[PDB]
Amino acid sequence: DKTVRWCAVSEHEATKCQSFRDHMKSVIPSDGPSVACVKKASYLDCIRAIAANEADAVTLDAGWVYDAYLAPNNLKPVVAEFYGSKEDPQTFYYAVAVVKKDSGFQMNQLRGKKSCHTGLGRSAGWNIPIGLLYCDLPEPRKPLEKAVANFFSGSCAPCADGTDFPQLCQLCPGCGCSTLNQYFGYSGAFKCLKDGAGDVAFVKHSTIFENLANKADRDQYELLCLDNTRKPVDEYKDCHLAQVPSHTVVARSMGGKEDLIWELLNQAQEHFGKDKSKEFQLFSSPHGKDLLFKDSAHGFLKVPPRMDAKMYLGYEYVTAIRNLREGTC
Ligand SMILES: [Fe+3]
């Protein structure tokens, strides 16, 4: 029992958060956990906010979890999302590269094409794909943004600095780091491809199924597999770039209300999880997709006691990120 200050990024998430608050009030008795909403412009401001005791929690893509960990913020993961089904929860998802059918190019011919990324530093939209092309990039490979800017002939990399690297915001001027940028995130990176701005979208396996309901329409897209061949979109299991850890809620290491955060989310999923309520849905919203939590999530799992970002993410993934931020060929 007490108040959890959730950090929403921009207007759409702020709206979902208000609804989340109000509905939780109509079901949770006076002594249960409650929600308060803090609006910030980017996930980055949410991190600082939480570290400065301005807010208490926020869900981040694993790549951004790593950023949350670095000093002086030192946030830790307390609750993770799980996908698939409640019967067989999956704490990972597949990063895929979606292209249009017959666009005429494989993974080893990305140079010169236009790319759509979910956001700078995110697992599927950035780390995995760039990680795999790292040495294909033209030297110098530092700064990384600059090298990526020269490989593609323009792209949309939300959260990148459009001043220092104009080419990274060519498909989405300003590189807005929130849903105010129509090309932000999974569904945004997908729209960037669908509209014809970009040639490839680095998203997750469920994105396309989340945006195109007709097999007819999904049939017009393909996935680039690491063996330089193309496969239909529902064959991602045999055509993906990598498996990455699930998004997770982070909190302060000192006085971070981790117990209250879990009590809230656990009670929230019971009352408003998948197909649980007609008045409100935690994993959906008419105001946007992947607001606060991913729509493709089914519930929450508590993270083991005092586990740090490094352990949570894993040796390999955590290294891939380091290598990306330095690495050699
Ligand atoms: Fe992600």
Side-chain angles (χ1 to χ4, degrees):
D1 177 42
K2 200 75 277 295
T3 296
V4 172
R5 299 169 297 174
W6 208 280
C7 193
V9 181
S10 206
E11 313 313 308
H12 306 138
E13 286 205 333
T15 307
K16 190 173 169 173
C17 190
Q18 296 190 202
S19 283
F20 180 30
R21 182 193 68 224
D22 296 343
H23 282 286
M24 287 293 295
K25 285 190 182 177
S26 82
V27 293
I28 297 297
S30 67
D31 56 4
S34 71
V35 183
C37 305
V38 174
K39 187 180 62 175
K40 293 297 179 186
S42 69
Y43 79 104
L44 228 42
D45 291 354
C46 276
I47 293 179
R48 283 190 280 283
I50 293 170
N53 186 39
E54 293 278 64
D56 303 311
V58 71
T59 315
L60 298 173
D61 162 76
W64 288 353
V65 170
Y66 175 72
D67 288 330
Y69 154 98
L70 303 180
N73 317 100
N74 301 136
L75 304 192
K76 61 170 178 183
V78 288
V79 180
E81 307 184 323
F82 75 70
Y83 314 103
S85 68
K86 307 171 188 180
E87 314 77 295
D88 174 35
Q90 318 184 89
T91 46
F92 66 92
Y93 54 96
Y94 306 91
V96 298
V98 196
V99 299
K100 290 185 173 186
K101 183 190 288 177
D102 305 323
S103 63
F105 72 82
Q106 304 300 162
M107 193 83 165
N108 59 342
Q109 324 178 298
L110 284 179
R111 179 181 290 77
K113 307 300 176 304
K114 291 180 173 56
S115 62
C116 308
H117 308 270
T118 63
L120 174 62
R122 295 178 56 149
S123 299
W126 185 262
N127 300 332
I128 297 305
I130 303 299
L132 287 165
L133 308 160
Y134 196 56
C135 302
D136 280 23
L137 303 187
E139 301 178 320
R141 301 184 181 77
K142 185 160 192 181
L144 180 59
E145 291 86 307
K146 209 294 184 177
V148 181
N150 298 302
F151 186 67
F152 299 123
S153 67
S155 37
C156 171
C159 314
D161 189 308
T163 306
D164 285 31
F165 323 108
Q167 300 118 297
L168 285 179
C169 316
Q170 192 182 301
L171 269 47
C172 60
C175 274
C177 195
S178 73
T179 61
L180 289 184
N181 170 357
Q182 68 168 331
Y183 289 164
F184 176 85
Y186 295 112
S187 284
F190 183 68
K191 189 184 185 296
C192 167
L193 175 72
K194 185 178 99 94
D195 297 338
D199 297 295
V200 61
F202 297 118
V203 296
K204 62 177 289 181
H205 70 275
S206 76
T207 310
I208 191 168
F209 296 97
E210 283 182 58
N211 292 281
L212 288 174
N214 308 317
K215 221 280 192 175
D217 294 309
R218 301 198 300 269
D219 266 330
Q220 285 311 106
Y221 303 73
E222 294 173 292
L223 302 188
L224 293 177
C225 322
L226 292 172
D227 58 15
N228 305 307
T229 61
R230 289 188 174 200
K231 287 209 182 189
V233 297
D234 43 47
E235 287 185 47
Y236 57 87
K237 292 199 179 182
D238 300 284
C239 181
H240 54 259
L241 312 180
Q243 283 177 33
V244 300
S246 63
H247 283 204
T248 83
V249 177
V250 292
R252 275 184 305 284
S253 50
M254 191 180 278
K257 307 182 186 175
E258 44 269 65
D259 55 332
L260 301 182
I261 286 168
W262 170 246
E263 196 182 312
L264 177 79
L265 295 192
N266 187 42
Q267 264 209 289
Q269 71 182 332
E270 273 179 32
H271 288 93
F272 306 106
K274 279 299 163 60
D275 336 303
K276 292 303 303 281
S277 160
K278 285 300 203 62
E279 293 63 61
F280 183 69
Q281 297 75 55
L282 212 54
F283 308 119
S284 185
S285 172
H287 307 292
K289 293 167 178 285
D290 309 320
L291 301 184
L292 306 178
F293 307 106
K294 284 169 61 178
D295 290 2
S296 61
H298 272 73
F300 302 115
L301 294 182
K302 197 179 175 184
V303 178
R306 285 185 287 278
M307 180 171 280
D308 86 320
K310 300 209 308 151
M311 193 167 287
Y312 179 73
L313 304 175
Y315 181 69
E316 36 178 292
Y317 187 55
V318 169
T319 298
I321 288 179
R322 298 181 194 125
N323 289 172
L324 186 56
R325 303 183 172 182
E326 297 178 292
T328 293
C329 309

